[PDB]
Design a protein around this nucleic acid. Sequence first.
RNA 1: GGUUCCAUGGUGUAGUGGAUAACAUAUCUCCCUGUCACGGAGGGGUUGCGGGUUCGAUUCCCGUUGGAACCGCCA
Length: 179
Amino acid sequence: NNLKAHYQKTIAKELQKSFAFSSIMQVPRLEKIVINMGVGDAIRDSKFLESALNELHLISGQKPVATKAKNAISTYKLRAGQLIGCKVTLRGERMWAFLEKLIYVALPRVRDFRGLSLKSFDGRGNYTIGIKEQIIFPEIVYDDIKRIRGFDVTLVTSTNKDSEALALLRALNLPLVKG
RNA sequence: GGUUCCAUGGUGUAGUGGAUAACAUAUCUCCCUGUCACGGAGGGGUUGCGGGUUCGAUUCCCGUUGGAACCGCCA
Ligand SMILES: [Mg+2]
């Protein structure tokens, strides 16, 4: 990606100067964006889960692996050995492609993207974005599951400090309130 | 003293071999009638206590209460 090379040059220079980092790779580096569109309807409407996967596939270019619960609950109708939820973890070129596509196409189409930040870092440098609806994503046709759901896009970084993660986010211009 | 059975709606009783609780009376609302009873329509209301097993107990297991049914002899 041309923006990937732009990321290289720009992130290196500003970050290096911003904290006098003694090495170019001391600057934070983003690793992997997990997407987890999971639903318990597979306990009853198994069909739905299948469609779920395809949409997830259609969004990232990686086929989603379906995850299984590690316990069993009667109230939730849960039982061990069943597949409830798919997770995809993008890396390399595809992860940066999805990140740019999200921030530039999907996110500003959000009904009311006022944003949320500073109050999202887990204290170790991660970040989770809770999407409310799937239809807003461009890689989705109107025909879909009878139920509509959101997403749990998350982020990782090489650093362990949440403040430096915020600094990388600002350098990348991820558009949130004051952050 | 010991042994078998039972505890389900307000009252009388069925079910459940773990995933679910009905019948009648009674109760409420509305037709009905001068009025009321009877009648007609509709509505509503449930596992003795505890503690384990199971993802899940009214049901399966062991204890604790209450009510019954049987026995407690030979000198
Ligand atoms: Mg005698």
